Amino acid sequence: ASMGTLAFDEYGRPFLIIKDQDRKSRLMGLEALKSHIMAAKAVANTMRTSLGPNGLDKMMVDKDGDVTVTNDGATILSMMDVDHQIAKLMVELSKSQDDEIGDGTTGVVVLAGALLEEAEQLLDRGIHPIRIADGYEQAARVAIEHLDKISDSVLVDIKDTEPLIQTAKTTLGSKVVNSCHRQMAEIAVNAVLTVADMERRDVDFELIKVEGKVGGRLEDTKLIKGVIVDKDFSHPQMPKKVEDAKIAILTCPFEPPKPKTKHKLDVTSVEDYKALQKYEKEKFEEMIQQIKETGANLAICQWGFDDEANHLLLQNNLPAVRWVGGPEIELIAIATGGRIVPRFSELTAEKLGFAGLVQEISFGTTKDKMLVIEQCKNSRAVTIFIRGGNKMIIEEAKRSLHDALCVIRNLIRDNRVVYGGGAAEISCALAVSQEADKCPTLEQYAMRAFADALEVIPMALSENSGMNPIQTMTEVRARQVKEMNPALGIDCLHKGTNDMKQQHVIETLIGKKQQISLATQMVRMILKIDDIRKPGESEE
Amino acid sequence: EGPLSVFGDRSTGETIRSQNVMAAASIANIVKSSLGPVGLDKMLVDDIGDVTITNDGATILKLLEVEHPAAKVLCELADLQDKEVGDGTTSVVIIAAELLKNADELVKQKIHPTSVISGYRLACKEAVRYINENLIVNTDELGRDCLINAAKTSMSSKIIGINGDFFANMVVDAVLAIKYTDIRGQPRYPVNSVNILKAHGRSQMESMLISGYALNCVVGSQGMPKRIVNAKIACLDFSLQKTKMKLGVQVVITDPEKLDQIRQRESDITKERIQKILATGANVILTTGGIDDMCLKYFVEAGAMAVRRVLKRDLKRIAKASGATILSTLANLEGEETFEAAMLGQAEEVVQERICDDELILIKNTKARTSASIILRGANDFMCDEMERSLHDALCVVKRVLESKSVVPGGGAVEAALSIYLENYATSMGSREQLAIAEFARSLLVIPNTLAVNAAQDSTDLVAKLRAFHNEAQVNPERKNLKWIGLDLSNGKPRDNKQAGVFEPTIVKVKSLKFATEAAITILRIDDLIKLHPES
Amino acid sequence: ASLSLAPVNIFKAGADEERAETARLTSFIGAIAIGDLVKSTLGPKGMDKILLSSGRDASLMVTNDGATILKNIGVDNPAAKVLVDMSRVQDDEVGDGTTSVTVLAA
Amino acid sequence: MMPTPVILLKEGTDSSQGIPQLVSNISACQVIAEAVRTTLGPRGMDKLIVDGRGKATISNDGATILKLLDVVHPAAKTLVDIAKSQDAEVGDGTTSVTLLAAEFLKQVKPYVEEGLHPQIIIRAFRTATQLAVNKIKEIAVTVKKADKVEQRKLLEKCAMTALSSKLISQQKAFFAKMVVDAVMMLDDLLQLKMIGIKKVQGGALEDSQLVAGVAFKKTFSYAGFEMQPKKYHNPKIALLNVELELKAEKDNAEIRVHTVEDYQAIVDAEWNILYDKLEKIHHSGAKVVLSKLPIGDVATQYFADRDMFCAGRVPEEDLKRTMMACGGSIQTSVNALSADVLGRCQVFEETQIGGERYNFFTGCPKAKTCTFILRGGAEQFMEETERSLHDAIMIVRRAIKNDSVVAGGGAIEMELSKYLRDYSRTIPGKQQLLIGAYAKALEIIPRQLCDNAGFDATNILNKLRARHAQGGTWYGVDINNEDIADNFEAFVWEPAMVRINALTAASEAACLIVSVDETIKNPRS
Amino acid sequence: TKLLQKGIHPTIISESFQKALEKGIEILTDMSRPVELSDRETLLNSATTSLNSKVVSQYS
Ligand SMILES: Nc1ncnc2c1ncn2[C@@H]1O[C@H](COP(=O)(O)OP(=O)(O)O)[C@@H](O)[C@H]1O
Ligand SMILES: Nc1ncnc2c1ncn2[C@@H]1O[C@H](COP(=O)(O)OP(=O)(O)O)[C@@H](O)[C@H]1O
Ligand SMILES: Nc1ncnc2c1ncn2[C@@H]1O[C@H](COP(=O)(O)OP(=O)(O)O)[C@@H](O)[C@H]1O
Ligand SMILES: Nc1ncnc2c1ncn2[C@@H]1O[C@H](COP(=O)(O)OP(=O)(O)O)[C@@H](O)[C@H]1O
Ligand SMILES: [Mg+2]
Ligand SMILES: [Mg+2]
Ligand SMILES: [Mg+2]
Ligand SMILES: [Mg+2]
């Protein structure tokens, strides 16, 4: 069963081959595969209840007791404290789906678990696990090409955002933020459209600042075509609003210069002391005069400044922010059209940014202030400011909006779109069944199993929605076969129609294809394992 | 574990088969060094300083503390061979282990264990047939020296080996003494009726064969004589003591004048019984029970020899040998109590003999049958016990030679011939059973291999020469006289063992093969093992 | 099957996974405990609670403010933590309603 | 034994001596082989091992598996060592070597048990090894045409073979093309450090790719990096070992001034030092700048304002690959930045690859480098992909240096077993048994293939023995048909040096293990 | 297992199993052939079949 090699030599002399062979364990052969399949089935059956609009959430508690409520499979499996190596493989799988796509993190796990659950029966019938893996690869190729076949295309222009709002709404249908469904989807779309080289090029998410502040309502979550900072003006008597703001972005602390090399300025006389004194005075005044002469109405430093500089800024009517972070300095530069300046001597009226509004914002009975920079001309940066009644819904809204942004990104990368509600899975299952009727008898059980596994997503959707899985799935499959229509799926919201093309239920073709590919590849690597050797020491 | 939830461990598949083979191999390697004239003895220390020297494989595997079931099986195999034959207890273990080894090799090659078992069964059947048809010698053609040669072959590898030249005579004589014929006039040689006593002292060469019987008993009183010539022997299975009323009998006095007479009977009753015995002429009285001092005095005054606490089996043998009748009671079919002189046995002498500061009783020249005792004499109790075991092996061998009058040659001759014949015979039986039969054949070679290894000689060369000789015998009808060739381990050279005098009873090899085959089959059927944790 | 009640346990020593009915059970009992704690402070005739901290200082507070009461309690139920954070956010947004929101959620 | 007053060795010294010690060594080797047996061949399986830290490694590679097993048996360490040696000299055959060594030991176990002197066995092993090695060198197919299409075909088939046992076999033709494309670009030493292998979690194996150029992950950019452009269409590339930031001019440097004018001059002097470096870098025409050392925020923003690209802290290996691909030199000083030392590519880009940002230098025609970018659903998935590609790459290198191929599926094993059986039937009779045992041992490779595939190894080996004795030299196991086949025609090709070194290493390990007659373990301090 | 997964009730599964059981009893009865206890060959063959599975099969 375990404990590796146990003989202890026929002669009677000690037989020690591996270190801690007595404390070590080992599982070999079909029982190892069955353990893997049970672990994967447990993980998948945990996740399948968080699938679809009627899917429920999970409340994860970390080591120090902080709570995270979520429906995101990647976040769940990351917060999940697993010790089984196959559960770790499933965590890696979901994280991989999140990296490549940003959506589908729960579908991949359910699908892989189903594929292994069917491989269980195939191994019981005596097929080699590698033959199962090869039949699964074949069926996955069939399903991928069939997805390319039944796929649809959507316009990714900025003038018709309705197909993108529909895609983003489908993405956010399963999350708690569907209470402001379209309000959330719209801003995710606008965000990705603001920050994108739309020549089917990349979308850098560093240009989207997702900020959350407890308070307010979810309906207050909005898109700021500019920047938000967690700072306020440096002096309490500066004005809290600046319109038509000319911004000088600086990475020089408003302090007397200091060489980076080890330096010792020697004072040797009262005249040296007075010269030092006036040098300090004149440096402060010269800095403020250089900031004024460029024409700026606002200053933004990265490194904080001192009392003389602060009061001179106030006196000269130069509102100023200090201790702004490098990333926020970069975003302010990108948004306002300004250039980041390392020293005052290098400051000119052209290196300045322009913001049509710079405001200081309060949050009720908090004492906390934030700085909004907006009304820029063509800001290539953007911020999504999320509000809510507790930090749990705020963090869930953040990750939900991340899912929506990743979906819009995947559309910008490939406009092709497959229809969801389990319809794509049913159609691929039909295609795999058809191609299995043609292959030789032995890889036909593995393709039929792949089809029966693809059919778990529609079953899960129906089940979570209270429908009877087998009844609903068989009816919609029969309808798909009779009236050729791969847009027929599960009415999770009970709108009457089974046509997802009419319900505007939309998934990304790359999303579904990546789900299938990742699930199949990981199922292959799992079926290919037939031996385990853990430390097994039960150490501390 | 896991899905099952059984509270125990589970081995399955090649793992447990490998474990079983390892266990059997371990047991066989324990005893391999004690095989043949060049085998050596073993010490066994019993965790308390109790020491046992031995070459007997059954003894060795009995003393061991074995936990693995596949090894307990081989221990029980050696025990069974010791019960049913009396020799071959080491060869059978070695052969069973080798059959297991080769059969597990075949099962690793993914020959189904059923097929290996079928092939082993077929090969066992055909090896038995081939022995019975081609490799047997009738002891009638050879006379009495055949028995001496079989005894010497059995005694080789024991501590009475080189002295076999003389010990075999004793062994043969002893069995011939205890010969008795039953209904159907078939001669029976019931060894374990030869008594074997041990007495450290004089050398082995001074061991004694007593035509008669030897008792590990002595007279009950020092005033009794210690030699009687015309011994009239009375064997009694009751005690001669002051008479005690049984459980349901009570003495209740209501007239004190009766008490004395009652007390007097408590002794006079026993006196009368003894007088009746002595009235017939009995000079020797052996009893399984006790003899009070009061009674011993009657025996002393009569000039008789009384012996108490004799053992029931010793008493049965003395009675059968002298012509006496074991009496549990002095009671006849006439409702009285008497002792007839016809119930007596006779013997030409009874003596109390001194043997190294320890006395025993010798009953010499009994009539109505001849009996046999053997007093083994060595340097200490360890040697004497090893001599007893060796002599038991030799006696059992001679008994088997006399019951079935067929012998086979030794020195690996039988195993070599069977290896040849079965490696040729496998070609006809199936395709996988063929491999099983070939492996049975090859396994049989572990005996000459081990003999040569123990002799510190080139096992490969010697066994190859053996197989060459036996192949020449089986392919050339003019050279069948080569069948009788086996190992000469004092020179490392094949030799005509039928002319050298290396004989073994056919039953030895036959039973070795049959038992080894069944044991291997039994162990070779296990493909799973559930070892439960102890109830506590 | 199930994550925890499976032939093999998939978790490190010390973790756990409450399923459907057990999860709603813990959630509802914890939230309702929090709510029954903070009520009776509600309204003009509401009565105060004592916040006898067990620290090395043993700070002592007497409050009718639901936000303070919930901040100053050692909670281990996650749903109760949710309600606690909710009352804190109410206290941040406006300065009243922390007991009304807590009782309402409960 | 008795207890001496003063014992010879230190108390606790464990000495195992004689035939039992040797048989125990053989059994330990059998254990080590069993530990990797099921990984052999296209139907082979992977092993999952877990460390004390709890990190799992999943591999089909026998050398890896044995490195992970914490083997302590002195005789079983030898199989681990010879698998390491195989991975060193060749890069494939690590499981075959262990199987062959253990089977040599298993086959001679009976003769060892009956007191046969080990010297005789080692003599027989040496003889049979020389014979089998010369026979491989004799019957190996070496096309003497130096044709480029056939020399690419040969490498592609050898790589497909080396990959038809892993979790990337279902794309092995894919990967084989790339592996050949990879090794056909290296110049003459075929350095592995000249092939880059990036692992970007997320994506499918077919989404993996080879870049005839270089690619490496974005490196801790400062503020202003997003203001930089991210695509250039014929850039000149400055490769530097230069720290570009305001820093102490030297660590043992101490400035001493007694005047505020001198103070100001010193501040401006530091700034002019940096800005002068930046101006030299800018005037060399380089639009892309890479430094093995940090590039500060000031330099980042400077280059952003000049519409240049800058990346600092680039790893040394990625810099050398950028050099070998783009065609420049790495400069610790920016004072002579000629077009001779600048590099050049047709396209530079920064793109997103599965959650990560990667810089691609593509379009280098003079490139002596290639970079693999591997996708997959797990760290260990991608790691075993990398290991598979390492097997294929080492195979292709060795084949490039010696295009002498033999057939697989046990074809060569059966031919050598035939030749050695024949040879053994012509010698006195002591060496006969041992060389016949060598021959029977060689049969473990096709036998293990059939076992791992789920066939009747006995019947298939009978078919093979028959077809190899009737005339026919490249007949071996056909796995998809559960039968035999001419593996040289089926294109199961394997460089001859693979099996040559496998036999050499296995025979040496067997000879060593069999020559040891005593093991003495001293107590550890 | 898979039936429950489909979303069928254990009561329906049990009753449908009873239906299949009745049909299977019918089918096996149809397959069967009657035998007379005097048919010693059938008895010997039944005993041999019963013994083929056990260690006592070479002694069958
Ligand atoms: N409005 C809807 N109607 C029908 N099906 C939907 C709807 N929204 C989502 N789904 C389905 O639910 C499944 C799960 O989606 P979701 O939970 O949002 O993300 P993930 O795929 O990461 O779990 C998808 O496969 C999709 O087909
Ligand atoms: N004098 C001899 N010469 C050759 N072989 C012998 C001789 N004596 C015994 N043998 C062989 O040794 C084997 C084992 O003998 P032994 O060890 O004494 O009995 P057991 O096997 O019962 O312990 C026998 O099979 C016999 O063939
Ligand atoms: N004179 C009054 N008559 C009726 N209701 C009152 C009166 N004064 C206060 N209240 C009620 O008492 C409640 C006081 O609630 P409070 O303890 O402040 O709740 P919270 O702590 O949630 O803000 C208010 O909700 C108000 O409706
Ligand atoms: N397509 C194939 N058909 C038959 N045998 C193959 C095939 N591909 C590889 N083999 C054989 O599989 C054996 C082991 O493969 P693998 O374990 O990956 O290599 P190694 O153990 O040598 O590192 C080799 O003998 C090789 O010839
Ligand atoms: Mg989703
Ligand atoms: Mg004997
Ligand atoms: Mg390989
Ligand atoms: Mg039965």
Verify whether the Cβ–Cβ distance A42 to C82 is below 8 Å: no
Q: Indicate the residue type of D507.
A: S
D349 beta partners: D231, D360
Residue A227's nearest CA partner among A296, A300, A161, A291 is A300
CB atoms within 10 A of CB A279: 18
Residue A524 burial (CB < 10 Å; 0-12/13-18/19+)? Answer: buried
Q: Indicate the residue type of A156.
A: V
A229 beta partners: A371
Q: Indicate the residue type of D146.
A: A
Residue A386 burial (CB < 10 Å; 0-12/13-18/19+)? Answer: buried
What is the rounded CA–CA span in Å between residue D131 and residue D479?
A: 29
Verify whether the Cβ–Cβ distance A9 to D27 is below 8 Å: yes
Verify whether the Cβ–Cβ distance B11 to A1 is below 8 Å: yes
Instruction: Give the list of residues 6+ apart from residue A381 with CB closer than 8 angstroms, or none.
Output: A194, A195, A207, A208, A209, A226, A227, A331, A334, A335
Instruction: Give the list of residues 6+ apart from residue B162 with CB closer than 8 angstroms, or none.
Output: none
Query: Residue positions of A in the annotated binding site for ADP?
Result: 52, 104-106, 174, 421, 491, 507, 512
Question: Token digits for D229?
Answer: 């452009």
Question: Parallel, antiparallel, or unpaired: how do β-strands B485-488 and B493-496 relate?
Answer: antiparallel
Q: Indicate the residue type of B511.
A: K
What is the rounded CA–CA span in Å between residue B176 and residue B191?
A: 10
- Chain centroid, CA B199 distance in Å: 20
Q: For ligand 2, is residue B455 a contact (CB within 6 Å)?
A: no
The verdict on whether B56 is a catalytic residue reads yes
What is the rounded CA–CA span in Å between residue A107 and residue A174?
A: 12
CA distances from A474 to A427, A457, A490, C49, D522 (A): 12, 13, 11, 60, 72
Verify whether the Cβ–Cβ distance C11 to A81 is below 8 Å: yes
Element (H, E) at A285: helix A270-293
Verify whether the Cβ–Cβ distance D270 to A88 is below 8 Å: no
Does the annotation flag C36 for ligand binding? no
What is the distance in angstroms between the Cα of C15 and the nearest Cα belonging to chain A?
A: 7
For ligand 1, atom 24: residue with the closest CA: A52
Map tokens 């080189």 to a residue. B162
* DSSP-assigned letter for residue A211: E
Nearest C-alpha in E relative to B117: E58
Question: In what order do the strands lie in the sheet containing D288-291?
Answer: D309-311, D288-291, D236-240, D343-344
Instruction: Give the list of residues 6+ apart from residue B43 with CB closer than 8 angstroms, or none.
Output: B51, B52, B53
* DSSP-assigned letter for residue D374: E
Instruction: Say if residues A407 and A508 touch (Cβ distance below 8 Å).
Output: yes
Q: D250 in contact with A at a CB cutoff of 8 Å?
A: yes
What is the rounded CA–CA span in Å between residue A102 and residue A94?
A: 10
Map tokens 């199949």 to a residue. A520
Question: Token digits for B455?
Answer: 């002799």
B231 beta partners: B347
Q: In sequence order, what DSSP letters do the residues of D164-205 get, joined into one string? A: TTSTTGGGHHHHHHHHHHHHTTS-SS--GGGEEEEEEESS-G
Instruction: Say if residues B464 and D116 touch (Cβ distance below 8 Å).
Output: no
Question: Token digits for C73?
Answer: 């309690």
What is the distance in angstroms between the Cα of B118 and the nearest Cα belonging to chain E?
A: 7
What is the rounded CA–CA span in Å between residue D436 and residue B400?
A: 43
What is the rounded CA–CA span in Å between residue D406 and residue D500?
A: 11
Determination method here? Answer: cryo-EM
Residue A368 burial (CB < 10 Å; 0-12/13-18/19+)? Answer: middle
Phi, psi (rounded to 5 degrees) for A387: -120, 165
Map tokens 């194996």 to a residue. D205
Strands (E) in B254-385, as ranges, are 284-287, 305-307, 345-354, 359-366, 372-376
CA C75–ligand 3 middle distance (angstroms): 26
Residue E13's nearest CA partner among E1, E24, E22 is E1
What is the rounded CA–CA span in Å between residue B259 and residue B254?
A: 9
Q: In sequence order, what DSSP letters do the residues of D243-293 get, joined into one string? A: -BSS--S-TT-EEEESSHHHHHHHHHHHHHHHHHHHHHHHHTT-SEEEESS
What is the rounded CA–CA span in Å between residue D454 and residue A530?
A: 14
Range of the domain at D364: 211-400
Question: Token digits for D315?
Answer: 């790893």
Residue D135's nearest CA partner among D519, D421, D401, D505 is D421
What is the rounded CA–CA span in Å between residue B147 and residue B135?
A: 18
Verify whether the Cβ–Cβ distance A364 to C12 is below 8 Å: no
B363 beta partners: B213, B350
Instruction: Give the list of residues 6+ apart from residue A450 with CB closer than 8 angstroms, or none.
Output: A115, A118, A135, A136, A139, A140, A143, A432
Instruction: Say if residues D256 and D371 touch (Cβ distance below 8 Å).
Output: no
CA distances from D296 to A29, A278, C78, D217, D303 (A): 56, 32, 45, 18, 11
Instruction: Say if residues A459 and A477 touch (Cβ distance below 8 Å).
Output: no
Q: For ligand 4, is residue D94 a contact (CB within 6 Å)?
A: yes
Question: Token digits for D71?
Answer: 């083997």
Which residue out of A105, A161, A383, A520 is catalytically annotated? Answer: A105
What is the rounded CA–CA span in Å between residue D329 and residue D341?
A: 5
D16 beta partners: D519
Count CA atoms within 13 Å of residue B111 on its CB side. 24
Contacts of B3 in chain A (CB under 8 A): 34, 38
Query: Residue positions of A in the annotated binding site for ATP?
Result: 52, 105-106, 421
Element (H, E) at A212: strand A208-214
SS3 B12: strand
* Exposure class string for D440-460: b at 16+ Cβ within 10 A, else e: bbbbbbbbbbbbbbbbebbeb
Instruction: Say if residues B3 and B93 touch (Cβ distance below 8 Å).
Output: no
For ligand 2, atom 8: residue with the closest CA: B153
Residue D94's nearest CA partner among D67, D63, D121 is D63
Instruction: Give the list of residues 6+ apart from residue D42 with CB closer than 8 angstroms, or none.
Output: A130, D164, D165, D169, D453, D479
Of D116, D430, D458, nearest to B109 by CB-CB distance is D458
Question: Token digits for D343?
Answer: 């590099």
Instruction: Give the list of residues 6+ apart from residue D152 with CB closer than 8 angstroms, or none.
Output: D180, D184
Residue A326's nearest CA partner among B443, D227, D473, D437 is D227
Q: A194 in contact with D at a CB cutoff of 8 Å?
A: no
What is the rounded CA–CA span in Å between residue B442 and residue B424?
A: 11
Element (H, E) at A517: helix A509-527
Instruction: Say if residues B75 and B517 touch (Cβ distance below 8 Å).
Output: no
SS3 A237: coil
Instruction: Say if residues A171 and A403 touch (Cβ distance below 8 Å).
Output: yes
Crossing angle between the packed helical segments A509-527 and A85-100, to the nearest 10 degrees? 160
Instruction: Give the list of residues 6+ apart from residue A244 with CB closer than 8 angstroms, or none.
Output: A297, A354, A356
CA angle D432, D436, D441 (to 5 degrees): 150
CA C66–ligand 3 middle distance (angstroms): 12
Which residue out of A72, A98, A452, A499 is catalytically annotated? Answer: A72
Instruction: Say if residues A163 and A419 touch (Cβ distance below 8 Å).
Output: no
Phi, psi (rounded to 5 degrees) for D341: -95, -15
Of A38, A365, A392, nearest to C94 by CB-CB distance is A365
For ligand 3, atom 26: residue with the closest CA: C43
Instruction: Say if residues D91 and D391 touch (Cβ distance below 8 Å).
Output: yes
Instruction: Say if residues B484 and B409 touch (Cβ distance below 8 Å).
Output: yes
Count CA atoms within 13 Å of residue D151 on its CB side. 14
Question: Token digits for B171?
Answer: 């062994």
Count CA atoms within 13 Å of residue D4 on its CB side. 6
Map tokens 């060198």 to a residue. D137
Residue B407 burial (CB < 10 Å; 0-12/13-18/19+)? Answer: buried
Residue A235's nearest CA partner among A369, A430, A91 is A369
Give resolution in angstroms. Answer: 3.1
Crossing angle between the packed helical segments A270-293 and A307-315, to the nearest 10 degrees? 40
CA angle D146, D152, D154 (to 5 degrees): 85
Element (H, E) at A44: helix A30-47
CA distances from A254 to A205, A304, A308, A323, D261 (A): 32, 7, 9, 11, 19
Interface residue ranges in chain E relative to chain A, Cβ cutoff 8 Å: 5-8
What is the rounded CA–CA span in Å between residue B19 and residue B523?
A: 11
Crossing angle between the packed helical segments B113-134 and B89-108, to the nearest 10 degrees? 140
Query: Residue D357 belongs to a domain with what CATH number?
Result: 3.50.7.10
What is the rounded CA–CA span in Å between residue E60 and residue A516?
A: 56
Question: Token digits for D394?
Answer: 């080492």
Q: B531 in contact with A at a CB cutoff of 8 Å?
A: no
Phi, psi (rounded to 5 degrees) for A532: -135, 145
CA distances from D257 to A263, A265, A270 (A): 8, 5, 16
- Chain centroid, CA C42 distance in Å: 17
What is the rounded CA–CA span in Å between residue B80 and residue B58?
A: 9
Question: Token digits for B234?
Answer: 């009375």
> Residues near ligand 3 with C-beta < 6 Å?
C 41-44, 46, 66, 96-100
Question: Token digits for B29?
Answer: 């390697």
Question: Token digits for D428?
Answer: 């006195």
* DSSP-assigned letter for residue D370: E
Map tokens 């050499």 to a residue. D504
Contacts of B5 in chain C (CB under 8 A): 7
Verify whether the Cβ–Cβ distance D115 to B464 is below 8 Å: no
Contacts of A470 in chain E (CB under 8 A): 6-8
Question: Token digits for D342?
Answer: 């600048």
Interface residue ranges in chain C relative to chain B, Cβ cutoff 8 Å: 7-8
Q: Indicate the residue type of B500.
A: A
Q: For ligand 2, is residue B505 a contact (CB within 6 Å)?
A: no
Instruction: Say if residues A516 and A147 touch (Cβ distance below 8 Å).
Output: yes
Q: In sequence order, what DSSP letters do the residues of A297-348 get, joined into one string? A: SEEEESS---HHHHHHHHHTT--EE-S--HHHHHHHHHHHT---BSSGGG--
Instruction: Say if residues B408 and B501 touch (Cβ distance below 8 Å).
Output: no
Instruction: Say if residues B42 and B90 touch (Cβ distance below 8 Å).
Output: no
Instruction: Say if residues D24 and A15 touch (Cβ distance below 8 Å).
Output: yes
